[PDB]
């Protein structure tokens, strides 16, 4: 039988949501960001994630409109917490971004690796051997993706799943009336498939399929999400 991460504690763990909507300070402070838009629609992503992961028995921890400094202070608070009685940690970041980074609402940059590496085995021992899941909804550049017709020691960086809304160098999309292509597809697939016992890689493959089928007709644009993982077991949310 396939190895599966333990996933039975109540709660399963914390699910942080860093939900950046108001970019007034970025527009003021950073010259090239003078017209960066407030992220209308992001409330629908936060709401879907909250519902989805509450139903999966996570404890939801929302934080709205975080500067880069505040994001680091929040992740440090969780890095230093005792997760011994938890089975999992999830962090959802909803923001603007560019290649390898996400923006704080002040327009400063936070390298994604600087965020995730706060939860390695050495930095957060009470999460060692437990899945650390990051979902990043941000652009990773400004290119439109084109479309074509058809005991034991384990590594410090083990047990991570990084769900990116897009491949490097390209945009991801937000509909103010709906939420984002990626987070909305992710929650739909989690809600349909977790009750069937499907694992997160199966689910993220479906998210790839669904988001791939959407179109930005005005720019003949597409979006290609991209998971990366160092998971050593099947990840299911019962």
């Amino acid at each position: 039988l396939d190895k599966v991460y333990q996933m039975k504690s109540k709660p399963r763990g914390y699910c942080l949501i860093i939900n950046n909507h108001n970019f007034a300070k970025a527009r003021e402070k950073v010259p090239k960001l003078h017209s960066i838009r407030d992220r209308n629609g992001t409330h629908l992503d936060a709401g879907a994630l909250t519902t989805t992961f509450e139903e999966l028995h996570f404890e939801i921890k929302p934080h709205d409109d975080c500067t880069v400094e505040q994001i680091y202070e929040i992740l440090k608070i969780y890095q230093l917490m005792d997760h011994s009685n938890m089975d999992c940690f999830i962090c959802c970041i909803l923001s603007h971004g560019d290649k390898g980074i996400i923006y704080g609402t002040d327009g400063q940059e936070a390298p994604i690796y600087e965020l995730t590496s706060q939860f390695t085995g050495l930095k957060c021992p009470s999460l060692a051997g437990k899945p650390k899941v990051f979902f990043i909804q941000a652009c990773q550049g400004d290119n439109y993706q084109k479309g074509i017709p058809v005991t034991r020691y384990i590594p410090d960086e083990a047990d991570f799943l990084l769900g990116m809304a897009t491949v490097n160098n390209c945009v991801s999309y937000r509909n103010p009336a709906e939420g984002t292509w990626y987070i909305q597809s992710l929650c739909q697939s989690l809600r349909e498939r977790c009750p069937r016992g499907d694992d997160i890689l199966t689910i993220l493959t479906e998210v790839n399929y669904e988001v791939s089928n959407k179109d930005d007709k005005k720019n003949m644009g597409k979006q290609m999400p991209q998971p990366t993982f160092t998971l050593r077991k099947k990840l299911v949310f019962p």
């Binding site: 992220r39 971004g97 652009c139 809304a165 991801s172 999309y173 937000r174 509909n175 930005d216 005005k218």
Partner: peptide, 5 residues
């Protein structure tokens, strides 16, 4: 009216 992030 799609918007990029």
């Amino acid at each position: 009216x799609l918007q990029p992030x």
